[PDB]
């Protein structure tokens, strides 16, 4: 008789601390080095493929971003690394990073018209100044928030007290428009000393415009710093402002919550149990090395390039 | 002769990488999975057990929390996760989490009368009582601060400076009463436009009342934002204010500055070397599954139900 062990013509190679490039009979390739190179649906739910559109451009509806006026349920927001149509009017949403962290757990919005445009009696809806946001010509503004201009040369105090009678959280976005100088104020808002006094049960703000000369950005020398809040059930948002108010028109009733993310990467159609911003991955491997960010039940990111468990005899 | 090994009738279970249930001989368990279940004395020192009371409710003396007006040496600050009596009047202690972090290393506060009520000649300190905090059903505001109001149809500008004159780091809490409207101001503080100007060696602050309409919380619509400062030795606090002043009336000398923590689980007459929010681990063993948060000569938390170390055989 003779004791021994089998062999084969395989060429898969593993590594050890003491030896390297050791040939083995059969070893499991635990590292998923392959990706389909496309973005698809996660568990039968299509993502939100914001094409050349940012979360600022989505939630504050950009006229160039009109494919998302009524969005279905999703599984992970998708955005480009440096989207172009992103706050076409210059400025920056305050706590923007907080909001995009908060949207990493909401799988669905319902756009509900909390505040129709008929609820601005003494204020004008002739707001054709945002030339930085062209869409089919003669652009006016975003659609989800209304930039109120004075009517009959007057700007009465905007005292609204919407109460979230709905039993679900609402995401209300408003803003303040920082003018170039006093000339734009008196040409837009007859009151020079303007303010906003948003008054949720938990929130308390007194904003003022920081009017000052500023540089060209997107062919506009003004700014608009936007703000957001989560109005809870039975709570009541209290807007009070006599100027420089990007009032809200739509809220986003948070009907579903779960696990989502924002991949920040540049759409396929095949089944994908897991996704990566570079491209989707479909395998049961323990590990992967495509990108840090993932979503769903996935393998575990490892920076290494060759993880191969030797399940065979050299 | 005959070589061999020790065999017993034990049923101890240990795990190896290649076989997950090995019947081992008297392997010592190094994970203590059990506890007393109650709050014990850390090194023979009484934990501060804030019963239905908070750090904000404790430091700013809450009428529902009168069992800690004079406090002995402690180790913990045990609090309820959902504290019922916590800032009864609506408000928000600014940098409250920073204050909790500072209190996570202060083992003692000697309450000291830095500012007696006789040092308020032209201002009323008796009628400043809020229905949000009832004392056995009667109105009564916090006692560690005084909610001043106008007296003799006037609110003269407080301008008071307290030199530390101690070898310890006394803590000073004050606040600003963010009122509801101009009428509440004129009823309380005769000056409509008010400012709280605080000054230390390392702290310049100017605060203004955000007189903004807001929701009703705890039966009251106003707000009171509280602010804390630690005053280093030989330093001097300087309070200037013509309104909305929740002036300080007690302070908290740091007699002892050691190691502590704040635990949010809701008293046992016992002794524990190391405590935990749910129970108290007394046995000496490297690991423990009880809770993440511990302080003292404690074991190492591990999120696993089995770490029996196979000191023995089979």
């Amino acid at each position: 008789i003779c004791i021994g062990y089998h062999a084969n013509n395989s060429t898969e190679q593993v590594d050890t601390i003491m030896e390297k490039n050791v040939t083995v009979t059969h070893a499991q390739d635990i590292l998923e080095k392959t990706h389909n190179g496309k973005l698809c649906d996660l568990n039968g739910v299509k993502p939100l493929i914001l094409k050349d559109c940012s979360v600022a451009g989505w939630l504050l509806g950009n006229p160039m971003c009109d494919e998302f006026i009524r969005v279905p349920e999703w599984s992970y927001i998708v955005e480009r690394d440096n989207p172009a149509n992103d706050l076409c009017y210059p400025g920056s949403l305050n706590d923007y990073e907080e909001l995009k962290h908060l949207l990493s757990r909401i799988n669905h919005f319902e756009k509900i018209l909390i505040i129709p445009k008929s609820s601005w009696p003494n204020h004008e809806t002739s707001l054709g100044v945002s030339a930085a946001c062209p869409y089919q010509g003669a652009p006016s503004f975003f659609r989800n928030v209304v930039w109120l201009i004075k009517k009959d040369d007057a700007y009465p105090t905007i005292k609204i007290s919407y109460n979230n009678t709905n039993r679900e959280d609402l995401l209300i976005l408003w803003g303040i428009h920082h003018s170039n100088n006093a000339e734009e104020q008196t040409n837009l808002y007859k009151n020079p000393t303007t303010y906003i006094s948003v008054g949720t049960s938990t929130l308390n703000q007194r904003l003022v415009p920081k009017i000052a000369t500023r540089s060209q950005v997107n062919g506009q020398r003004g700014r608009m710093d936007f703000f957001w809040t989560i109005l809870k059930p039975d709570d009541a948002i209290h807007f009070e402002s006599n100027g420089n108010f990007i009032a809200p028109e739509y809220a986003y009733k948070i009907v579903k919550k779960g696990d989502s993310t924002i991949m920040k990467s540049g759409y396929g159609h095949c089944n994908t149990k897991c996704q990566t911003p570079v491209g989707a991955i479909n395998s049961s491997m323990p590990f992967h090395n495509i990108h840090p960010l993932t979503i769903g039940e996935c393998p575990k990111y490892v920076k290494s390039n060759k993880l191969v468990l030797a399940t065979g005899l050299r | 002769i005959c070589i061999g090994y020790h065999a017993n009738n034990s049923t101890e279970q240990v795990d190896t990488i290649m076989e997950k249930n090995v019947t081992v001989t008297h392997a010592q368990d190094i994970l203590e999975k059990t506890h007393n279940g109650k709050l014990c004395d850390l090194n023979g020192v009484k934990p501060l057990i804030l019963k239905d009371c908070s750090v904000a409710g404790w430091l700013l003396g809450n009428p529902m929390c009168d069992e800690f007006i004079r406090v002995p040496e402690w180790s913990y600050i045990v609090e309820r996760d959902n504290p019922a009596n916590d800032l009864c009047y609506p408000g928000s202690l600014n940098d409250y989490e920073e204050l909790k972090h500072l209190l996570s290393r202060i083992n003692h506060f000697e309450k000291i009368l830095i500012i007696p009520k006789s040092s308020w000649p032209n201002h009323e300190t008796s009628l400043g009582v809020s229905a949000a905090c009832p004392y056995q059903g009667a109105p009564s505001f916090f006692r560690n601060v005084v909610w001043l109001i106008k007296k003799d149809d006037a609110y003269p500008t407080i301008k008071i400076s307290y030199n530390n004159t101690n070898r310890e780091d006394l803590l000073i809490l004050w606040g600003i009463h963010h009122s509801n409207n101009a009428e509440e101001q004129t009823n309380l503080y005769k000056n409509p436009t008010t400012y709280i100007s605080v000054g230390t060696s390392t702290l310049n602050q100017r605060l203004v009342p955000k007189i903004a309409t807001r929701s009703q919380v705890n039966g009251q619509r106003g707000r009171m934002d509280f602010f804390w400062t630690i005053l280093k030795p030989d330093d001097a606090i300087h309070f200037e204010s013509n309104g909305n002043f929740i002036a300080p009336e007690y302070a908290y000398k740091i007699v002892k500055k050691g190691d502590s923590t704040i635990m949010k689980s809701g008293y046992g007459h016992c002794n524990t070397k190391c405590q935990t929010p749910v129970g108290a681990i007394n046995s000496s063993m490297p690991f423990h599954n009880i809770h993440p948060l511990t302080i003292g000569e404690c074991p190492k938390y591990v999120k696993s139900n089995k770490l029996v170390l196979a000191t023995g055989l089979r």
Epitope: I114, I115, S119, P121, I160, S161, H238 | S215
Partner: antibody
Framework: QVQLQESGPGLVKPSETLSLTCTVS????????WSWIRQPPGKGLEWIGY???????NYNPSLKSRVTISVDTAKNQFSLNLNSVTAADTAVYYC???????????????????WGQGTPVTVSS | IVMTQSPLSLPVTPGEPASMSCRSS???????????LDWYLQKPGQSPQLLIY???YRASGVSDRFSGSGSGTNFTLKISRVEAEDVGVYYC?????????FGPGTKVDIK
Amino acid sequence: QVQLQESGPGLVKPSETLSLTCTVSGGSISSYYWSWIRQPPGKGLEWIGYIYYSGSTNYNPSLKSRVTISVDTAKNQFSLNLNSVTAADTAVYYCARDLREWSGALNYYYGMDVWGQGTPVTVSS
Amino acid sequence: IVMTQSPLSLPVTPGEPASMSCRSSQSLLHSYGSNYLDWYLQKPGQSPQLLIYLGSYRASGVSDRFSGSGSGTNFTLKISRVEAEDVGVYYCMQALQTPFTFGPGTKVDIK
């Protein structure tokens, strides 16, 4: 520049229905409350009632039982014809928009921006 | 709610500050903190015009001269500087509950 124009006769006798209709010229009858307020001679204003643009009705108890309520959104108008008229109901009847949004989730009250010029009704045998 | 204006007729002069008081018989502070009291002006032979709303906030097209204040049962209107156009009846109308009522009306006239 929204105008509220009163219509109908300015004459009526006792024990019948006085006719008057309010046409919303220059605006619309959408998303707004609409109220009628009377001014008797030598007396302060008295609020009769109002109707929501859907048609939700609320009355004054002083004239709850004998006020017809109606809104006709086809031509952008609303009409409330007082019935069982007595001699004491002689008053100048004014239209008015109302911005109460009193029910529902919204609540904002600017309040009675636009009024009609008024119709001098005269109840007389 | 029963309302009353303490000046039934406020004799004013041009170019001088003036004020009037309107008192209710019920806490007019509506939920959401707003008082829900309107001040209307009515010139001789003209429809009412909303001078003020929710106690203090001015209506469109109303000068800075008018301003109101009050939270409880008491309320006050204040004309910083009076003109001939201000002559007329001032109504203080509560809008808390469905049975709306108006004050007796203060006929501001030149002294």
